[PDB]
Design a protein around this motif. Structure first.
Motif, PDB file in Angstrom:
ATOM      1  N   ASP A 147      -0.054   3.015   8.388  1.00 42.26           N
ATOM      2  CA  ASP A 147      -0.754   1.915   8.989  1.00 42.26           C
ATOM      3  C   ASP A 147      -0.493   1.844  10.479  1.00 42.26           C
ATOM      4  O   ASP A 147      -1.196   1.144  11.173  1.00 42.26           O
ATOM      5  CB  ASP A 147      -0.346   0.557   8.366  1.00 42.26           C
ATOM      6  N   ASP A 187       0.776  -1.223   0.000  1.00 41.29           N
ATOM      7  CA  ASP A 187       0.000   0.000   0.000  1.00 41.29           C
ATOM      8  C   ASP A 187       0.802   1.264   0.000  1.00 41.29           C
ATOM      9  O   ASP A 187       0.306   2.329  -0.395  1.00 41.29           O
ATOM     10  CB  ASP A 187      -1.097   0.077   1.080  1.00 41.29           C
ATOM     11  N   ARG A 188       2.042   1.156   0.466  1.00 39.12           N
ATOM     12  CA  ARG A 188       2.937   2.265   0.548  1.00 39.12           C
ATOM     13  C   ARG A 188       3.963   2.306  -0.557  1.00 39.12           C
ATOM     14  O   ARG A 188       4.207   3.373  -1.142  1.00 39.12           O
ATOM     15  CB  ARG A 188       3.667   2.188   1.877  1.00 39.12           C
ATOM     16  N   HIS A 213      -5.494   4.006   6.424  1.00 42.47           N
ATOM     17  CA  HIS A 213      -6.731   3.604   5.803  1.00 42.47           C
ATOM     18  C   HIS A 213      -7.863   4.210   6.582  1.00 42.47           C
ATOM     19  O   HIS A 213      -7.860   4.192   7.803  1.00 42.47           O
ATOM     20  CB  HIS A 213      -6.861   2.092   5.919  1.00 42.47           C
TER      21      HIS A 213
HETATM   22 ZN   LIG Z   1      -2.158  -0.766   5.013  1.00 46.46          ZN
END
Ligand SMILES: [Zn+2]
Ligand SMILES: [Zn+2]
Length: 214
Positions: A155, A77-78, A197
């Motif tokens: 996160d 995600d990063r 998120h």
């Molecule tokens: Zn994440």
């Protein structure tokens, strides 16, 4: 709305992309900084396809080039778009540990230029990166905009609605509360906290994350 941008102030926006996992959309946030010297992102996106889509969108929106991205940990995600970044000459900043873990997790390597506390400046936009300690991962960092008291938690920081820490196989769950405490200590009067998120909030997200970790 697979890729969306949402404004915090003139030059600071949240980018959010829906990853597609098992037929579910899964949003991830980062930041877009509109500076006099280009756009600077906090985090890329889940993969190269989405990263390209993200970059295309922001560059078109602001009529400015993405010049730099700050990678907050070495998961998809990063860092998922790092290949796109590198093949575009977009600088991918990270701690050395994130770079080490990137190489281990099969990603191309970011710069490893960030220390525990690092000050960057892009045009007039000041950016602090802070490694608060282990949590979601060993390497997770947060990003702070001291001009605007905006914190990007990644996160490490859960949104208000989150009731779950997520995948903790490589998390340091005990240490995570200390790391959050370190963030709470460092950043006292926060206007906005962007979780990795979910919805943007304020210091309440940090407290909420502590609560989840109790
Ligand atoms: Zn994440
Ligand atoms: Zn992660």
């Amino acid at each position: 709305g697979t890729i969306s941008i949402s404004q915090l102030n003139k030059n600071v926006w949240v980018h959010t992309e829906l990853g597609s996992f098992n037929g579910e959309a899964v949003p991830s946030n980062g930041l877009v900084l509109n500076t006099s010297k280009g756009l600077v992102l906090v985090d890329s996106s889940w993969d190269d396809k989405l990263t390209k889509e993200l970059i295309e969108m922001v560059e078109k929106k602001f009529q400015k080039r993405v010049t730099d991205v700050i990678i907050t940990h070495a998961h998809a995600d990063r860092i998922g778009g790092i290949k796109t970044l590198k093949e575009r000459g977009i600088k991918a900043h990270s701690t050395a540990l994130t770079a080490e873990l990137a190489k281990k997790n099969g990603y191309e390597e970011p710069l490893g230029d960030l220390q525990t506390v690092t000050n960057l400046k892009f045009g007039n936009m000041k950016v602090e990166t802070f490694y608060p300690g282990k949590g979601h991962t060993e390497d997770n960092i947060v990003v702070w905009l001291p001009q605007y008291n905006i914190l990007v938690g990644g996160d490490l920081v859960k949104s208000t609605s989150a009731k779950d820490l997520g995948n903790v196989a490589d998390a340091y769950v005990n240490e995570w509360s200390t790391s959050i405490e370190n963030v709470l200590k460092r950043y006292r009067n926060i206007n906005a906290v962007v979780p990795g998120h979910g919805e943007v909030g304020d210091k309440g997200l940090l407290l909420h994350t502590l609560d989840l970790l109790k």
